[PDB]
RNA sequence: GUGAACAGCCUCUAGUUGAUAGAAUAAUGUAGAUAAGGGAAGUCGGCAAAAUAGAUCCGUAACUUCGGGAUAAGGAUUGGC
RNA sequence: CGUGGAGGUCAGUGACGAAGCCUAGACCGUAAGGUCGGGUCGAACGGCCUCUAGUGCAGAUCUUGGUGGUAGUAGCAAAUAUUCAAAUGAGAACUUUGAAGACUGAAGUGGGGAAAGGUUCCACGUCAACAGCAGUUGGACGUGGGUUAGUCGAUCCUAAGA
């Protein structure tokens, strides 16, 4: 199904204990795994603005909580093996605390 | 032609060959023995799963001091690996053999790997002590499955005993 | 170096350590279980008002570390008879109860979620019209068995554990003739046995468990995760789950249960019966532990002296806990910003 | 495309380092057709190649 | 810029992002640290670590070839406004 | 008993298959060895009487060449550090562009020379080998283009010396 949701990912507990030189690359991989877990798609594409937010404070300064918008969409190329894929984009909020998973009514 | 020892009908077979291939002989021997005798579709799906690290290739001879893995349990071994280069070469050869069978007009659902063989190609050297590669020759044959007087020298006494039995019976 | 009797230092074959010796039986006594199953749930501290003549601490109060073992009642689900042979004890017959919970039926599967759950479904058909086969097997046990053990399982669903698969064990029945043992088992099929019908306060018990695992250590090799049998641990309290004021003594009138503030760390609250045992026992939190009766009639005045507890520490174990109850914490701090 | 030569020529033509020239990721074929300094100059004029501004080193705290 | 300073540390112009990668995080090894109480009891042997360290003010012994010893030793101070 | 070559002879064997090699096959001899069948192969070769010698190997830390086990094992842990998207392409962790994060930090990972090297410079094409993974990249390979002086040097002068 074509669907769009907004999630909060707790990067603090997913990055607990990771070496400082690996925190932001590990966050990239964790977000890919998180999107795969929630949408079922093995093809996760991250927005460069999302990567910018991840790397905002250097390689070892990733934020504790991140508000994401994940859109599972149809692969309209008809070339890739997976029928669907997920696109992860950042959501700009003052604070990422206290927010629950919501459904976006795309219009 | 000029393949290894094969005991199969040529008219129901197709062949594929690859020589001087820049891939490890030991790894490729393990891959080929993993495939030997399987159905063609089963082997192809298996090699895809190996590429995806969901199933492994058991290493039975060239397996000294390699890692142990739960994915060996399928074949009763404890040592299995995922040789990507070997898998790619072998599945290229499988695709070539399947195409040859299609051109020959063989029924692709009955095809199984009836022969597969890896031996060593001439070594290629580089220097940076010997520093050589171990290339492979690979050959394989896929074949269709097909469903499905001794005179005796008795002595005179033996013949007499047989006749006595016959007379005693009906 | 090391005690050569604990060789080889290899991993225990199971997570549940085996009871390798039950107390010597005395047939004149009533029928009793020799052992019980529990789950280790953290430690805490108590103040004991000591009455020990001869000691420098006679008529004085001491502070002791204690272990709390969560012990919801066990379910009796079977009986097994043993015959002695020139080659040792041999099991002759196992008889099961008619109905078994999913808690114990999970023990017989590697992949419960994927199964048809057919276990014991054909066995239950023996209790069909007369129970003649069940009665014949019980008669066989009564006639030939020299040792009778009962099959029990824990109620792990009553614990805070994520595991749904119950632990199953044999517990020797001591006291009474063989026929009386078998009758007791048959009467208790599908029934629960509580920890206070097995043990009582002031009694010395033994703790059998597999110790904390430490992996590879530098000869080098496996360290920890060994079966151990520690003896002579005194029971300071047999508490009740349905009892409020589990942690309240005659000297401390605060109505509070045994559970520390914030819960035990890596283990939830205690909502069942429990055993408070003086000192430490092998294993770590959440480990299944076996509590055994003393093998011998203890000749120590320690096994005889009654335990009078003055206070049980229910402060938080998740930090430097200062308050026994949240009411005390609120009364100390006062009114916070979000209270208004 | 390989715009290594185009990046070098844009640096020379604008007079700044290669670290200060911007090549439009959308006009890739158009830039790839630019093999001459005159073509680079035309692309600079119409904005396909842009000189970036210097990284600020302010002396306010000093 | 800091600072006595072509020191160390951070930045602008210019240049580079090269070094086989991925997943785990047991012991051991190497490098770098911390530690109750005691304080050389260790060892052939205080080996190695620790402690000291800039600048201002005070103050400075024996010996001396009168030039030194000397930053002798030993004290006080250091931010912001 | 066996080998290279020489004189004589068997009007010896042979493309209808000499020699050689392989053989789970056969026979003779105490043995050195000899003979036959089958396969493979393609141009020469044998028996006997004699002549002649660079004439018989398990060794010599033997010579030259080839090849194993070790072993898919040791190892590719300095140089703080990479990441997202698109393009190209059969194929992209490594090419190109954009976006981020870092670094050398003016005694530079910046810009020039002497000497040395010799085309490495630039473009187009290309990946069999090489750049100790990869590669669509390259100081690699193929093909072309490129170095302009009265004033910058040499050339002139003398030095130690020859």
Swiss-Prot record, chain A:
Magnesium in keyword set: no
Matching InterPro entries: Ribosomal_eL31, Ribosomal_eL31_CS, Ribosomal_eL31_dom_sf
Keywords assigned: Cytoplasm, Ribonucleoprotein, Ribosomal protein
GO cellular component: cytosol; cytosolic large ribosomal subunit
GO biological process, alphabetically ordered: cytoplasmic translation; regulation of translational fidelity
Keyword tRNA processing found: no
Domain of life: Eukaryota
A GO term for molecular function: structural constituent of ribosome
Entry's transmembrane regions: none
Subcellular location: Cytoplasm
Function: Component of the ribosome, a large ribonucleoprotein complex responsible for the synthesis of proteins in the cell. The small ribosomal subunit (SSU) binds messenger RNAs (mRNAs) and translates the encoded message by selecting cognate aminoacyl-transfer RNA (tRNA) molecules. The large subunit (LSU) contains the ribosomal catalytic site termed the peptidyl transferase center (PTC), which catalyzes the formation of peptide bonds, thereby polymerizing the amino acids delivered by tRNAs into a polypeptide chain.
Subunit text: Component of the large ribosomal subunit (LSU). Mature yeast ribosomes consist of a small (40S) and a large (60S) subunit. The 40S small subunit contains 1 molecule of ribosomal RNA (18S rRNA) and 33 different proteins (encoded by 57 genes). The large 60S subunit contains 3 rRNA molecules (25S, 5.8S and 5S rRNA) and 46 different proteins (encoded by 81 genes).
Other comment: There are 2 genes for eL31 in yeast.
Entry similarity comment: Belongs to the eukaryotic ribosomal protein eL31 family.
From Swiss-Prot, chain B:
PROSITE patterns associated with the record: RIBOSOMAL_L22
Keyword line: Cytoplasm, Isopeptide bond, Phosphoprotein, Ribonucleoprotein, Ribosomal protein, Ubl conjugation
A family per Pfam: Ribosomal_L22
Cellular compartments annotated: Cytoplasm
Keyword Transcription belongs to the record: no
GO biological process: cleavage in ITS2 between 5.8S rRNA and LSU-rRNA of tricistronic rRNA transcript (SSU-rRNA, 5.8S rRNA, LSU-rRNA); cytoplasmic translation
GO molecular function: structural constituent of ribosome
Residue positions, PTM Phosphothreonine: 69
CDD domains linked to this entry: Ribosomal_L22
GO cellular component terms attached to this protein's record: cytoplasm; cytosol; cytosolic large ribosomal subunit; preribosome, large subunit precursor
Highest taxon of source: Eukaryota
InterPro entries: Ribosomal_uL22, Ribosomal_uL22_CS, Ribosomal_uL22_euk/arc, Ribosomal_uL22_sf
Site of covalent link Glycyl lysine isopeptide (Lys-Gly) (interchain with G-Cter in ubiquitin): 45
Subunit structure: Component of the large ribosomal subunit (LSU). Mature yeast ribosomes consist of a small (40S) and a large (60S) subunit. The 40S small subunit contains 1 molecule of ribosomal RNA (18S rRNA) and 33 different proteins (encoded by 57 genes). The large 60S subunit contains 3 rRNA molecules (25S, 5.8S and 5S rRNA) and 46 different proteins (encoded by 81 genes). uL22 is associated with the polypeptide exit tunnel.
Note: There are 2 genes for uL22 in yeast.
NCBIfam families: uL22_arch_euk
Family: Belongs to the universal ribosomal protein uL22 family.
PANTHER family xrefs: 60S RIBOSOMAL PROTEIN L17
Name listed for the protein in its UniProt record: Large ribosomal subunit protein uL22A
Species assigned in the record: Saccharomyces cerevisiae (strain ATCC 204508 / S288c)
Swiss-Prot record, chain C:
Site of covalent link Glycyl lysine isopeptide (Lys-Gly) (interchain with G-Cter in ubiquitin): 29, 126
One record GO biological process: maintenance of translational fidelity
Subunit-level organization: Component of the large ribosomal subunit (LSU). Mature yeast ribosomes consist of a small (40S) and a large (60S) subunit. The 40S small subunit contains 1 molecule of ribosomal RNA (18S rRNA) and 33 different proteins (encoded by 57 genes). The large 60S subunit contains 3 rRNA molecules (25S, 5.8S and 5S rRNA) and 46 different proteins (encoded by 81 genes). uL3 forms together with ES39L one of the contact sites for the signal recognition particle that targets ribosomes to the endoplasmic reticulum membrane.
Main location, first listed in the record: cytoplasm
Keyword flag Ribosomal protein: yes
Gene3D superfamilies from the UniProt entry: 3.30.1430.10, Ribosomal protein L3, domain 3, Translation factors
Disruption phenotype: A mutant confers resistance to trichodermin, a trichotecene toxin produced by plant-pathogenic fungi.
Phosphoserine PTM sites in chain numbering: 14, 146, 250
The name this protein goes by in its record: Large ribosomal subunit protein uL3
Taxonomic superkingdom: Eukaryota
Phosphothreonine: residues carrying this PTM: 93
Any GO molecular function: structural constituent of ribosome
Lineage summary: Eukaryota, Fungi, Dikarya, Ascomycota, Saccharomycotina
Note from the entry: Present with 450 molecules/cell in log phase SD medium.
Underlying gene: RPL3
Entry's localization field: Cytoplasm
Similarity section: Belongs to the universal ribosomal protein uL3 family.
Record-level GO cellular component terms: cytoplasm; cytosol; cytosolic large ribosomal subunit
Alphabetical list of InterPro entries matching this protein: L3_arc_euk, Ribosomal_L3_dom_3_arc_sf, Ribosomal_uL3, Ribosomal_uL3_CS, Transl_B-barrel_sf
KW Signal (keyword) present: no
From Swiss-Prot, chain D:
Phosphoserine: residues carrying this PTM: 29, 36
Extent of the signal sequence: none
Cross-link (Glycyl lysine isopeptide (Lys-Gly) (interchain with G-Cter in ubiquitin)): 20, 52, 59
A GO term, aspect molecular function: structural constituent of ribosome
Localization terms from the record: Cytoplasm
Domain of life: Eukaryota
GO cellular component: cytosol; cytosolic large ribosomal subunit
Keyword Phosphoprotein: yes
GO biological process terms on file: cytoplasmic translation
Keywords on record: Cytoplasm, Isopeptide bond, Phosphoprotein, Ribonucleoprotein, Ribosomal protein, Ubl conjugation
Note, other: Present with 97700 molecules/cell in log phase SD medium.
Oligomeric and partner information: Component of the large ribosomal subunit (LSU). Mature yeast ribosomes consist of a small (40S) and a large (60S) subunit. The 40S small subunit contains 1 molecule of ribosomal RNA (18S rRNA) and 33 different proteins (encoded by 57 genes). The large 60S subunit contains 3 rRNA molecules (25S, 5.8S and 5S rRNA) and 46 different proteins (encoded by 81 genes). eL19 lies in close proximity to the binding site for eukaryotic initiation factor eIF4G.
Family: Belongs to the eukaryotic ribosomal protein eL19 family.
Protein name as annotated: Large ribosomal subunit protein eL19A
Native organism: Saccharomyces cerevisiae (strain ATCC 204508 / S288c) (Baker's yeast)
Gene: RPL19A
Parent-record interval covered: 2 to 63 of 189
